[PDB]
Amino acid sequence: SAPVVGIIMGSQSDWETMRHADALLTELEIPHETLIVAAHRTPDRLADYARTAAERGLNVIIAGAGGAAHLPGMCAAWTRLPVLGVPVESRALKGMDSLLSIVQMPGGVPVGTLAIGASGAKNAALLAASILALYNPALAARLETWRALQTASVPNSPIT
Amino acid sequence: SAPVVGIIMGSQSDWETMRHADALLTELEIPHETLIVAAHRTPDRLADYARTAAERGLNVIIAGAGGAAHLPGMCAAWTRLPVLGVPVESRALKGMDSLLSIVQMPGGVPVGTLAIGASGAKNAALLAASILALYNPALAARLETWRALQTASVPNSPI
Amino acid sequence: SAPVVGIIMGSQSDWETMRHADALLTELEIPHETLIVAAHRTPDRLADYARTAAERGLNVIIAGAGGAAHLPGMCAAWTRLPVLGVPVESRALKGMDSLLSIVQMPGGVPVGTLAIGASGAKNAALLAASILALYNPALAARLETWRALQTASVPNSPIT
Amino acid sequence: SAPVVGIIMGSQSDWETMRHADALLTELEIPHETLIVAAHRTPDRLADYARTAAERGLNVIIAGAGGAAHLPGMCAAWTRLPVLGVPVESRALKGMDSLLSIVQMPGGVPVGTLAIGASGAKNAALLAASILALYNPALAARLETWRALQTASVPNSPI
Amino acid sequence: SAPVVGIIMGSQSDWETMRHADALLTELEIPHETLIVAAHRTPDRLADYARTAAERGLNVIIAGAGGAAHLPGMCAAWTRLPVLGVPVESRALKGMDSLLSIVQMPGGVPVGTLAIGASGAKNAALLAASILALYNPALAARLETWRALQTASVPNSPIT
Amino acid sequence: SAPVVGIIMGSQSDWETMRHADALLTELEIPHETLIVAAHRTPDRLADYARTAAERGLNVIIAGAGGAAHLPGMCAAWTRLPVLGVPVESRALKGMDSLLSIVQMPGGVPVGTLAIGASGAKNAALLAASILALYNPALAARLETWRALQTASVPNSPI
Amino acid sequence: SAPVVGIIMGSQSDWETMRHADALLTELEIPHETLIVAAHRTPDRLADYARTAAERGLNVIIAGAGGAAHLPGMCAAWTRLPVLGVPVESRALKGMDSLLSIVQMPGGVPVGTLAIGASGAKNAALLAASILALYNPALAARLETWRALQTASVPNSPIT
Amino acid sequence: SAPVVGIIMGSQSDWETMRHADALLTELEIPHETLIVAAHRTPDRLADYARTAAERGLNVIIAGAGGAAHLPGMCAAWTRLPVLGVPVESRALKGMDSLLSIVQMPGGVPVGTLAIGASGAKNAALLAASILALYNPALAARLETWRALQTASVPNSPI
Ligand SMILES: O=P(O)(O)OC[C@H]1O[C@@H](O)[C@H](O)[C@@H]1O
Ligand SMILES: O=P(O)(O)OC[C@H]1O[C@@H](O)[C@H](O)[C@@H]1O
Ligand SMILES: O=P(O)(O)OC[C@H]1O[C@@H](O)[C@H](O)[C@@H]1O
Ligand SMILES: O=P(O)(O)OC[C@H]1O[C@@H](O)[C@H](O)[C@@H]1O
């Protein structure tokens, strides 16, 4: 019932990307919350969200942002929980600004960063699942089944 | 006098760069404070610094950071004062990470960004001076003199 | 009545970007002028515009250009006023040439640079407003209201 | 105690970087193993290491590589454990090749990627610690202390 | 009859690119097989494919992948045969991630890398043909004819 | 003799690079002047230099600058003479900023751009020589000799 | 009558870009030839074209190419004439491969390089005109008129 | 014996890199020649070298160049032999110019491209060896031994 993963993003425009994280957590039956938290437009909301996350029972935060993408890193500054960052693709620089803004954190405050775009959102959810599976045997079984099906679904040759 | 510019940086390792901003403000006799404020390692210190800057009488904030450089942008999130950002040169990516994480602010929260490195630190101080000069005539004259000396001192041929 | 901000750009093609600066100054009731000044095709026009800006009562110049983008920097060479630069997105290099051409000024002649594209134009106007607000209490109040409304308009969760 | 984190790297030349991960895990008293596993030069060693990691009791793998950096991704292909990737700074391209070859994993096989270089190695260890802390209360308290000391130790002004 | 070149790729999406290699081998009458082998989703399939390639009679492997593109390099780790790599164009980073992931192999395990995209696929097939032509005189003649026709087909001036 | 090529650069720090252009013109006995002209620090000096270049008898201008490198383009704005641009290697971005700010001129005002660094300075001088050689037969013969010696002097094997 | 500028390019696909050079030379009444010369597919044609250019009366060569763009540099290797290079925009890398392939010539063999794309083609023609104008007074007058009209045609403000 | 691989490079400055290809071919006892051939400074030497390579009995050409690196591609234009390209690390752009000017060959004339720098030179020699091994059984066995020793010699832990 109570959420164990928080998915956060700075804008509705980020949802086109972050929806892939939401869908995968739901597929794996991982209770979660999905919210908008804007690092620059709602910085006090961010501080409160991140600093209370652990006491609220969250175990992992998945944060997506694009451009000068500060949401994952500032989240990580305020929580001891693992924070996973999804670089959202930007218009001009194709997410390279997003990527460098998120992955290049200073020693002492980590953000586990995934690929630019939808792939990264899906993989943030899978990485969160991998973390939770360490201490949830039922989920561990669901995740192993999921990975096995992924492997079995790969064809032997292309449709030419 | 009470400071009217705050120079802030995330680490002692930024000082090699940000000292150029400090020196310039001193040269132009602009009262200022020079502090370490770490966006990631001291986020509550940052929130407090930025949100109280205006009531403390600061007029401009100069913020320097390298890598995933969030200090200028998060400062701007908490203050209506103009915030000027200095990308510090990072070891691997030579400040390109610094530059993009500072300049690419989405619309609604600006950071006026200067060049990577020492040039950017000097120019953040000069840009702060040009802002203050709009409503301080004595400083405006000192800034005019500074720019005039810069122009007049350029040699005509290389040695 | 008399303009206190000048918005300048090198071409009509730049207007698609710089119109966002114009609109925001108008929203905040900041008197301004909006002109075409081409660094390469009208260099004497630029010299005259920049060197007379202060005596004409301008307080801030917002300059946009793309490609080998020299308009903001050459403006700054000729005026003591703060100059803010907007990198206009270019076709091949997506504004990276614009950005580096504008932001990498030598020590001694500053240009306060904003994001590539529309975001940068909007933020140049907001930064200009922040500067003017230091010595205009009515504008300072309008700007604080504007920022507060921005913060209040952020939803708590995405439309899924 | 039996290791719960494996730190692996493709070469001795990566050790200058990955030693920072090793030191951090030691500081936090997290039992770990530190090994060379080369994706290209010892691919069967990699397959064996990754596929048996869970049954050996590992909880997290930290993998560092430079250049065409395939070690973290291929590790993740063979294990359901979380795999954290450290891009090692390469000579010519300063770790940009390392970074893109690690972080740009297609959907379905994740690698949580940290910064280029020593910062990334330290942060992979801290991220592993934060994962383990979710279900080890004594470690969680030591990690809290570590983060608190980091925050409290930041000076207020540069020297 | 029996294949002497293997063309492998990680996904059906790669076929839009790798089909150009397949077509050129067919044009030059080089027997080959075309398969899907996913480095990350079917890593045991890859190990088996690469380690048995020589004993199965393959002489050259052409491998295409995009993004964090590991298929060519991991193939090369498991075979003594020459491995040629085709960087498939990726959405955000335009194949620059593909290119660097493939070409920047450590000393000791080579991948001969071709251009991003369709050009690279065509050239991987031509390079494979060049290799086989060293010890197949009939193919050597076909390849020389092919190159000669290419040269003769270049017009002297553009259609204006 | 009166100069027919002007070599200009924004700073003494550019001289390490631009000296290669100066040396080449001297070697080919092309009368020239070598000057500092700063686009940002001495913009009126630049306008005057460029607008009077043709009437002073200059035929080609070689302009070198680093960073936000505006000197070649603004020179070309004020003269119909051919302007050749040398991107000087900058500290952080290794001349990539220099290169893009010089070469990406919009249509209507050209700058013929050479390689980043010393190679580009040498080649700007050679390109200027090849322009002058079109209407100076003695120089054309000296340039032929120079290119012939370059070709003939390449060794057949490394030492 | 006889051509004094040669415009060369490696493919018909380059014409979309190089046509802007052709049009400007025609506008300025500069006699020229426009040809296809492929560095990689017709290397002997290139050697012959470049090594005979001066004796044929050419004064400037404008060469365009994209990707691994070798046509301008190899032209310059074989002629003492000034060679101007136009980087043609490539699909994946947006002409950055074209640009670096052309501009980064070794000391001793120059190529005067212009902008990526149509702007560069137009400017190669203008630069060629500037060179020819040094020893053709009538053209010098036409070029000064052209530049003056360019300056006079810049509006004072945008259409908003 | 008569050479079956030609190693060519544009300058003595490339030798620091290309010596790694030479050493590897020597180690595997592959008869080869090692020469300077400059695409821009000696274009007729290049045309002659490439067009006669096959009739001279060469089987593979390894070509190294930096900057605007045209040597491998122009070699491939004149021969049907496989041409392998080594991007030499350039001073300013760290071989990114070298890499793009070699690898981005349009369809119809291939160059098999290796990594920037010494790794690429070593790997061009190994790739040439793997090509030759297809039809030389003694060499194939020596190459098997070489790869086996590489794999077996990787240490299990860092020192
Ligand atoms: O890890 P240290 O050296 O303290 O800081 C290195 C970089 O991390 C950033 O926060 C600072 O702005 C600095 O540029
Ligand atoms: O060639 P050596 O120095 O062994 O290794 C250099 C790089 O090759 C990669 O596999 C390693 O991760 C390292 O970063
Ligand atoms: O600040 P200094 O060292 O004078 O000049 C550094 C760079 O600033 C540019 O104007 C010059 O062309 C030079 O490349
Ligand atoms: O100017 P030098 O040092 O002779 O050569 C430097 C670069 O120019 C290229 O042709 C060579 O391949 C080398 O990488």
Contact of A20 with D108, CB cutoff 8 Å = no
Residue F40, token pair as written in the block? 């940002």
Contact of H87 with H69, CB cutoff 8 Å = yes
Contact of B127 with C107, CB cutoff 8 Å = no
Domain covering H1-159 assigned CATH 3.40.50.1100 in the classification? no
* Alpha helices by DSSP H, chain B: 15-27, 43-52, 71-78, 96-103, 118-132, 137-153
* Alpha helices by DSSP H, chain C: 15-27, 43-52, 71-78, 96-103, 118-133, 137-152
- Taking phi over 0 as left and psi of -120 to 50 as alpha, with beta for the rest, E117 belongs to left
Contact of G47 with G38, CB cutoff 8 Å = no
Cβ-Cβ contacts under 8 Å for B63 (sequence gap 6 or more): B7, B8, B9, B37, B71, B72, B75, B83, B84, B85, B86, B111
Chain breaks in chain F following residues, C–N > 2.5 Å: none
What is the maximal distance between C-alpha atoms in chain H? 52
Q: What is the 3-state secondary structure (H, E, C) of chain D?
A: CCCCEEEEECCHHHHHHHHHHHHHHHHCCCCEEEEECCCCCCHHHHHHHHHHCCCCCCCEEEEEEECCCCHHHHHHHHCCCCEEEEEECCCCCCCHHHHHHHHCCCCCCCCEECCCCHHHHHHHHHHHHHHHHHHCHHHHHHHHHHHHHHHHHCCCCCC
Q: What is the dihedral of CA E145, E146, E151, E157, to 10 degrees?
A: 130
* Interfacial residues of F (vs H; Cβ cutoff 8 Å): 89, 94-96, 115-117, 119, 150-151, 154-159
Classify residue D63 by burial, with Cβ atoms within 10 Å: 0-12, 13-18, 19+. buried
**Phi, psi of E3, rounded to the nearest 5 degrees:** -70, 140
Touch criterion met for H and E (3+ Cβ pairs within 8 Å)? yes
Q: Which ligand is nearest to the CA of H65?
A: 4
> Nearest Cα to G103, choosing from G83, G131, G118?
G83
Residue type, F65: A
Contact of H15 with H9, CB cutoff 8 Å = yes
**Phi, psi of C39, rounded to the nearest 5 degrees:** -60, -40
Task: Find the angle CA(E128)-CA(E2)-CA(E150) to the nearest 5 degrees.
Answer: 35
* Alpha helices by DSSP H, chain F: 15-27, 43-52, 71-78, 96-103, 118-132, 137-153
What is chain E's alpha carbon radius of gyration, rounded to the nearest angstrom?
Answer: 16
Residue B110, token pair as written in the block? 């600006």
What is the maximal distance between C-alpha atoms in chain F? 52
- The verdict on the CB of residue F22 being under 6 Å from ligand 3 is no
Task: Find the angle CA(D121)-CA(D127)-CA(D131) to the nearest 5 degrees.
Answer: 145
Nearest to F92 among B89, B150, B159 (CB): B89
What is the maximal distance between C-alpha atoms in chain B? 52
What is chain B's alpha carbon radius of gyration, rounded to the nearest angstrom?
Answer: 16
Residues having CB closer than 6 A to ligand 2 are D 10-11, 13-14, 65-67, 88; E 106-107
> Nearest Cα to B33, choosing from B10, B55, B64, B2?
B2
Experimental method reported for this structure: X-ray
Mutate to test the pocket of ligand 4, among H7, H9, H14, H93 (most ligand atoms within 8 A of CB): H14
- Domain-wise residue ranges, chain G: 1-160
DSSP H or E segment with residue H46: helix H43-52
Contact of F58 with F49, CB cutoff 8 Å = no
For an interface test with C, which of B102, B123, B139 has the most C Cβ atoms less than 10 Å from its Cβ?
B123
Residue D133, token pair as written in the block? 């802390």
> Nearest Cα to E107, choosing from H12, H146, H68, H15?
H146
Beta strands (DSSP E) in A66-127 are 83-87, 112-113
Q: Looking at beta carbons, which residues of chain E come within 8 Å of H119? A: 104-107
- CA–CA dist C108, B125 (Å, integer): 10
Q: Dihedral sign, CA of F112, F113, F114, F120? A: positive
Q: Looking at beta carbons, which residues of chain H come within 8 Å of F116? A: 92-93
Contact of B59 with B8, CB cutoff 8 Å = no
Classify residue D137 by burial, with Cβ atoms within 10 Å: 0-12, 13-18, 19+. exposed
> Nearest Cα to D40, choosing from E110, E100, E64, H143?
E110
- E72-85 burial string, b = 16+ CB within 10 Å, else e? bbbbbbbbbbbbbb
Contact of G40 with H72, CB cutoff 8 Å = no
Q: Dihedral sign, CA of D147, D149, D150, D152? A: positive
- CA–CA dist F19, F2 (Å, integer): 20
Cβ-Cβ contacts under 8 Å for A86 (sequence gap 6 or more): A17, A18, A21, A62, A63, A64, A65, A72, A102, A113, A114, A120, A121, A124
- If DSSP codes are grouped into helix, strand and coil, which group holds residue F61? strand
User: Please, which residues bridge with residue B85 across strands?
Assistant: B63, B113
- CA–CA dist F85, F108 (Å, integer): 16
- CA–CA dist A38, C150 (Å, integer): 11
- CA–CA dist G82, F112 (Å, integer): 11
Identify the DSSP state of C105: P
* Interfacial residues of A (vs E; Cβ cutoff 8 Å): 89, 94-96, 115-117, 119, 150-151, 154-160
Instruction: Tell how far the Cα of B123 is from the centroid of ligand 3, in angstroms.
Output: 13
What's the distance, CA E62 to chain centroid? 3
- CA–CA dist D88, D65 (Å, integer): 5
Residue type, A102: I
- Quick check: G91 and E117 CB within 8 A? yes
Contact of E82 with E61, CB cutoff 8 Å = yes
Instruction: Tell how far the Cα of A105 is from the centroid of ligand 1, in angstroms.
Output: 9
Classify residue B4 by burial, with Cβ atoms within 10 Å: 0-12, 13-18, 19+. buried
What is the maximal distance between C-alpha atoms in chain G? 55
- CA–CA dist H132, H110 (Å, integer): 18
User: Please, which residues bridge with residue D34 across strands?
Assistant: D7
Write down how long chain G is. Answer: 160
Contact of D18 with D64, CB cutoff 8 Å = yes
3-state helix, strand, coil in chain G (%, to 5): 45, 15, 40
Identify the DSSP state of B105: P
> Nearest Cα to G18, choosing from F127, H104, F82, E159?
E159
Edge-to-edge strands, sheet with G112-113: F32-36, F5-9, F60-66, F83-88, F112-113, G112-113, G83-87, G60-65, G5-9, G32-36
What's the distance, CA B50 to chain centroid? 14
- CA–CA dist H149, C112 (Å, integer): 58
- If DSSP codes are grouped into helix, strand and coil, which group holds residue A151? helix
Nearest to C82 among B59, B122, B131 (CB): B131
Question: What architecture (CATH level 2) is domain E1-160?
Answer: 3-Layer(aba) Sandwich (3.40)
> Nearest Cα to H135, choosing from H4, H23, H22, H2?
H4
Helices G15-27 and G118-133: crossing angle, nearest 10°?
Answer: 30
Other CB atoms within 10 Å distance of the CB of residue B23: 13
- Interface partners of B (3+ CB pairs, < 8 Å)? A, C, D, F
- Taking phi over 0 as left and psi of -120 to 50 as alpha, with beta for the rest, A69 belongs to beta
- CA–CA dist F125, G110 (Å, integer): 9
* Interfacial residues of B (vs C; Cβ cutoff 8 Å): 20, 59, 80-82, 84, 99, 103-116, 118-119, 122-124, 126-127, 130-131, 133-135, 140, 143-144, 147, 150
Residue B74, token pair as written in the block? 């998060």
* Alpha helices by DSSP H, chain G: 15-27, 43-52, 71-78, 96-103, 118-133, 137-152
- Quick check: C40 and F105 CB within 8 A? yes
Q: Looking at beta carbons, which residues of chain H come within 8 Å of G104? A: 67-68, 90, 93, 97, 101
- CA–CA dist F19, F124 (Å, integer): 12
- If DSSP codes are grouped into helix, strand and coil, which group holds residue H6? strand
